[PDB]
């Protein structure tokens, strides 16, 4: 089998991007946030706080005849960025593009932190990392694409983020026509349950490229691109009145400027970032400063290849018994 589904960003910036699921029997369509950093499935359903759901769509398990309570079973996760949500979980028939799994967890929210109720755009967040992260207690769920892979045409999925415009996941198979050249794969630890894997080295606009290793997370759920400080602070150093401000919480640079590219190594091959992918706009509404796309990781404590990156590649994520990773320019 395979699955084909187009994803969409929220808003002028690409902050996230939203991909349509079908949940229950009849469908239940809502609109998610598909996360290679996180292994839950988790939505705004009919338990979730009232006070806590701002225009989101509902999951609501009673409506599907095909949902079942897991009794016993509760969920809590904390992310990088400070959100959190929790609640209880049904098993119930998932598809995304096409391709359906039956018995998945559903993670219905019983609560949800600030920054999901103030976002009406997205209705929950189904996780792509590795199963060893799902945070369903006292037994363990399985992720979508654990639950699809031994259905699939292969054992890969892939994500084709677009900027500033709409961009496809698939599921089982790869497009080859929606990418150029050829993909370059590179290995990948499961140790921390992530799409973990170390860039062969950087450039910054037309400069040398500097070869050192950049062990980080293909994340197609963090917005921005986290890297050591040395690299933040050459790429920063390129773009005039650029400068780190502890108020704003990172790099901002005058609207002004044209921004320079970033090129990321993955073995021999290159993947290049336009400027323009950097640009994450005014810090607040009418402000000559704006907010950088290429951040400091110093504070994490992890890489990340958020959708910065991921957005100028097409990305295959292979779940062969040996997982990689494959990138291409497109
Ligand atoms: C650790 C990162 N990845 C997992 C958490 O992913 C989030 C997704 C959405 C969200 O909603 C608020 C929002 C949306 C867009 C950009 C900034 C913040 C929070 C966290």
């Known amino acids: 089998s395979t699955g084909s589904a187009t994803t969409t960003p929220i808003d002028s910036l690409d902050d996230a991007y939203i991909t349509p699921v079908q949940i229950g029997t009849p469908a239940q369509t809502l609109n998610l946030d598909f996360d290679t950093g996180?292994?839950?499935?988790?939505?705004?359903?009919?338990?979730?706080?009232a006070s806590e759901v701002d225009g989101q769509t509902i999951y609501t398990p009673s409506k599907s005849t095909t949902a079942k309570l897991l009794s016993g079973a509760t969920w809590s996760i904390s992310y990088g960025d400070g959100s959190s949500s929790s609640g209880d979980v049904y098993t119930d028939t998932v598809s995304v593009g096409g391709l359906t799994v039956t018995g998945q967890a559903v993670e219905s929210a019983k609560k949800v932190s600030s920054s999901f109720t103030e976002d009406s755009t997205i209705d929950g967040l189904l996780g792509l990392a590795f199963s060893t992260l799902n945070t369903v207690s006292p037994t363990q769920q399985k992720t979508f694409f654990d639950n699809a892979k031994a259905s699939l045409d292969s054992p890969v999925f892939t994500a084709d983020l677009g900027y500033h415009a709409p961009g496809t996941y698939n599921?089982?198979?790869?497009?080859?026509?929606?990418?150029?050249g050829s993909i370059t794969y590179t290995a990948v630890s499961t140790k921390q349950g992530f799409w973990e894997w170390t860039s062969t080295g950087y450039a910054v606009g037309s400069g040398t490229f500097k070869s050192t290793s950049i062990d980080g997370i293909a994340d197609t759920g963090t917005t921005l691109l986290y890297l050591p400080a040395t690299v933040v602070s050459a790429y920063w150093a390129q773009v005039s009145g650029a400068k780190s401000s502890s108020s704003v919480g990172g790099y901002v640079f005058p609207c002004s400027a044209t921004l320079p590219s970033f090129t990321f190594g993955?073995?021999?091959?290159?993947?290049?970032?336009?400027?323009?992918?950097?640009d994450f706009g005014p810090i607040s509404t009418g402000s000559?400063?704006?907010?950088?796309?290429?951040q400091s990781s110093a504070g994490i404590g992890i890489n990340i290849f958020g959708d910065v990156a991921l957005k100028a590649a097409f990305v295959v994520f292979?779940?062969?018994?040996?997982?990689?990773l494959g990138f291409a320019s497109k």
């Open 38 to 49: 996180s292994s839950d499935l988790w939505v705004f359903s009919s338990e979730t706080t």
């Open 171 to 180: 599921f089982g198979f790869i497009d080859t026509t929606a990418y150029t």
């Open 266 to 278: 993955v073995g021999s091959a290159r993947i290049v970032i336009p400027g323009d992918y950097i």
């Open 288 to 294: 000559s400063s704006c907010f950088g796309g290429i």
């Open 318 to 324: 292979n779940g062969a018994t040996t997982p990689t």
